[PDB]
Amino acid sequence: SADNGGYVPAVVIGTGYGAAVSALRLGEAGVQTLMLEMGQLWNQPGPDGNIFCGMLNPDKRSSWFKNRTEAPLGSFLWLDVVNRNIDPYAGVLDRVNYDQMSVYVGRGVGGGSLVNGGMAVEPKRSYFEEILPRVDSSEMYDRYFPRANSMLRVNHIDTKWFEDTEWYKFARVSREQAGKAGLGTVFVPNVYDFGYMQREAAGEVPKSALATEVIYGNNHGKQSLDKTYLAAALGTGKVTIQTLHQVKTIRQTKDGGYALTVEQKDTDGKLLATKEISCRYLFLGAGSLGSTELLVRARDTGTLPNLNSEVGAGWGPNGNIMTARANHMWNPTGAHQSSIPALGIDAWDNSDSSVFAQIAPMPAGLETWVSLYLAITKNPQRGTFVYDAATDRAKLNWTRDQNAPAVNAAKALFDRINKANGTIYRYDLFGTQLKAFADDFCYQPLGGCVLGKATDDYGRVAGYKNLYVTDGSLIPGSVGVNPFVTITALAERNVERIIKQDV
C-alpha cells in the first residue's frame, strides 16, 4: 500500500501535532492508519555522530532544500561566520518564503516538534472563548488541555536551579529589567526534560540545550512527538509511517472515499516513484501551510470542487514580532545561555495592546549584552492563500504593512522597559537597514482552514464527508501564546468526536 500504492482505511497527511494525535486515537480505535510524511525519520547518526546539527555547526541537515545555511534569526551578526554552502537536502527546518513573509516549519517525522523551543503553554480561557466562540470551553479546559499536557510530557523548571544557574542569567536579566518597569514574568512549561537539563549543566549527561541546539533539532532532552504521541501510535499495532512521501493531489473517488497522488523522493530530492493511495477516512495534518495548500489546489484544479470560499482564508502569524534591547555594561546576559526559553513577560489582557513575550536565548557563546524577545501580539490583520495555477503553488497574499499593529503593540511594551531602564533597542540584528522589529517572519503560522469557517466545529471539511483537517490551519490566526498545546488539545477533542460519530 505504502510500498506500491493501494487502499488503507485511514490516511493521515503529515506527522506534526494534529496528525500525531489523530493517528494515536485512530489506532487505539482499531482503525488501520497510514501516515504520509514528506520529510525524514530523524534517527540516523550523521557525519559528526549526531542525528542533528547544532546552531554553531550547521550543515545540510539544518535546511530543507537550500544551498546555503542561515543564521538563527537575531544572531546573524555572530553566527554568519559559521554559515556554509550546502547541498540541497531533505533537512529538518524549512524557511518557506512568500512575497512579504517567511514562515519557518519543521520537515520530518514529528513536524515542528523536532525544531521548536518546546514551550508548552495553554491559552488564556477568556481569549480562547473570544477566538472560538462556537467551541465548548469547559470541555477544553476540564478534559482536553489536561490530556494534551500529560501526553506531551509537559514539565516545569526547578525554580532554585533556575535562580542559580549561569545558563539562565539571560532570563534573570530581562526579568529584572522588566521588574523596573512594573512588568511581571511567568515561567513557561516545556517538553524539554528540565531534570535532564540540570544534569547537562552538572556535566553528567550529553548536552543539547546547553550545547546550542534547538532549531535544527535536539540530540537529547526534548520530547518531540516521535517519542510521545507517534511512539504510542506505532505501539497500537495499527499505524505505520511512510517517510519521504509528499501528497500532491486529493480527489474524491466515485463511491465517496479519497484518492491521493503521492511522490516518493530520496533525500537529494530525486523523484523515485509516484503512487496512488486511497482510503475511506482522510485526515490532513500537513500544517497551516501544507493543509491549506492541498485544499486550495484541490478546489481550484477541480478535484474537490465543492470546497467553500473560506478555504485559504484567515491566516495570521500569531502576531509574531522579534526585537532586541542593548543592556547596560553592568547587565551582561552571559556567554552560556540555555537554548530553551524558560521565562516570558505576560502583558496579555486581550486588548489590542496585548503582548506575551518570551525571553529568548542567543547562541553566540560570547558576551553580547543583547536581550532578545519573541513577542506574540493581537493584530486583527489576516492573509489569504491564493492558488497559482501557473506554478501549482498556494501563494500567501500578506503584506508587511499588515504587521504594523503587531509592531506597534510590541514597541509600546518594550518602549516602557527602555524608558524605565535608560536602554535602547538594537537596530542591526536583522539586516543592514536600521530595523529594531523583525516583522516578516513567522514560527507559528495559524489559519487557512479555519474551524467553523472552512470546516465544521470539529474540523470536518465543509462540502465533504470523511474528510478532516486536524492542525494549525484550524486556528483563526492567533492564540495569544505558543500554539502547539492548543493544536494538540483541539486535535484530541476533534478526533474523539469524529471517531464516535463518523467512524
Interacting residue with ligand FAE among 247, 370, 410, 450 (CB under 6 A) = 247
Q: Which of residues 107 and 207 has its CB atom nearest to ligand FAE in the complex?
A: 107
Three state DSSP letters for 334-368: CCCCCCCCCEEEEECCCCCCCEEEEEECCCCCCCC
Residue 229's φ and ψ, nearest 5 degrees, are -60, -45
CB of 235 to ligand FAE, least distance (A): 20
Site for ligand FAE contains 229 (CB under 6 A): no
Three state DSSP letters for 308-321: CCCCCCCEECCCCE
Residue 371 grid coordinates: 536581550
Q: Between 17 and 36, how does the x/- string for binding to ligand FAE read (CB under 6 A)? A: xxx----------------x
CB of 41 to ligand FAE, least distance (A): 11
Site for ligand FAE contains 443 (CB under 6 A): yes
Interacting residue with ligand FAE among 69, 440, 483, 490 (CB under 6 A) = 483
CA angle 326, 329, 331 (to 5 degrees): 80
Closest CA to 171 of 321, 437, 417, 372: 372
Give the count of residues interacting with ligand FAE (CB under 6 A): 41
Residue 278 bridge partners (DSSP): 7, 259
Rounded to 10°, the helix 484-502/17-28 angle is: 30
Q: Which of residues 257 and 445 has its CB atom nearest to ligand FAE in the complex?
A: 445
Q: Which residue has the cell 548536552?
A: 207
Half-sphere exposure at residue 169, Cβ-oriented, CA atoms within 13 angstroms: 15
Q: Which of residues 79 and 331 has its CB atom nearest to ligand FAE in the complex?
A: 79
| Region of 54-62, 117-125, 362-370, 391-399 interacting with ligand FAE (CB under 6 A) | 117-125
Closest CA to 295 of 467, 163, 150: 467
Residue 90 bridge partners (DSSP): 64
Site for ligand FAE contains 117 (CB under 6 A): yes
281's enclosing H/E stretch is strand 281-284
Site for ligand FAE contains 108 (CB under 6 A): yes
| Region of 24-32, 101-109, 426-434, 456-464 interacting with ligand FAE (CB under 6 A) | 101-109
CB of 137 to ligand FAE, least distance (A): 19
Contact 209, 200 (CB under 8 A): yes
Site for ligand FAE contains 62 (CB under 6 A): no
Q: Given the rule CB under 6 A, which residues bind ligand FAE?
A: 13-19, 36-39, 104-108, 111-113, 115-119, 215, 246-247, 285-288, 290, 294, 443-444, 471-472, 482-484, 487
